[PDB]
């Protein structure tokens, strides 16, 4: 007598009128003229926006910083809209459309002569941000397949998650910090400038606590 179990009911869930992902334009509506600096610190460190779920239950989590151009948005859109069931699923964008202009000089020119012309636009992404959020009358095992397929093609380390796995991921890291048997931590040493270590560190390392190196995130670091 194989023991059967109840099944979750999604009857209480509603589906919007346009479940599929809307189209993202290459450049913003009005083209920008003022050229901007590189400002690389927009992909450095943890994210302070779009770190929590709003409507859906499954998403693609960013495990590193990077820039998204139009080519990335089309890959996410087509791959998801093709592999998902419009009736029982829906998806939304958790990242704005490309707005940061990227200049580029013409081929064959030497250093100098001013600044280059705007070539394309990107969207900066920090680690810990949700890129795409999905939901509906579906379990995670259904979407986890093609969401990871998308996550592998992104320019940064990404991974599909759910409200549960994300919560568990965070609680497991807190458990590691508490049960760590090592009496020496990056935070304690840096904040107290032990060994004069702040001569080889950065001011951001006071807040990142060794979990970040440039745009790369290290989850095994406590």
């Amino acid at each position: 007598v194989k023991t059967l179990l109840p099944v979750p009911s999604f009857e209480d869930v509603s589906i919007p009128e346009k479940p599929k992902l809307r189209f993202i334009e290459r450049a913003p509506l009005v083209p920008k003229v003022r050229r901007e600096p590189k400002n690389l610190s927009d992909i450095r460190g943890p994210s302070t926006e779009a770190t929590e779920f709003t409507e859906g239950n499954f998403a693609i989590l960013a495990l590193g910083g990077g820039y998204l151009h139009w080519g990335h948005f089309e890959m996410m859109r087509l791959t998801i809209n093709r592999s998902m069931d419009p009736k029982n699923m829906f998806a939304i964008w958790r990242v704005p459309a490309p707005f940061k202009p990227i200049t580029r000089k013409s081929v064959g020119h030497r250093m100098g002569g001013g600044k280059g012309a705007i070539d394309h636009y990107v969207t900066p992404v920090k680690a810990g941000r949700l890129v795409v959020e999905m939901g509906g009358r579906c379990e995670f095992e259904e979407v986890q397949g093609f969401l990871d397929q998308v996550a592998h093609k992104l320019p940064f380390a990404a991974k599909a998650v759910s409200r549960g796995t994300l919560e568990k991921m965070r609680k497991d890291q807190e458990e590691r910090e508490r049960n760590n048997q090592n009496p020496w931590t990056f935070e304690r040493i840096a904040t107290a400038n032990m060994l004069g270590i702040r001569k080889v560190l950065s001011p951001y390392d006071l807040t990142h606590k060794g979990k970040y190196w440039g745009k790369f995130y290290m989850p095994k670091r406590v």
Binding site: K105, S106, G108, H109, R110, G112, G113, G114, K115
Partner: peptide, 18 residues
């Protein structure tokens, strides 16, 4: 070889007023 354009921004050479 391939010549390049110049910068179109002029001025901005003022010194600090202390």
């Amino acid at each position: 070889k391939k010549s390049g354009g110049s910068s179109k921004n002029l001025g901005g050479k003022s010194s600090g007023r202390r």
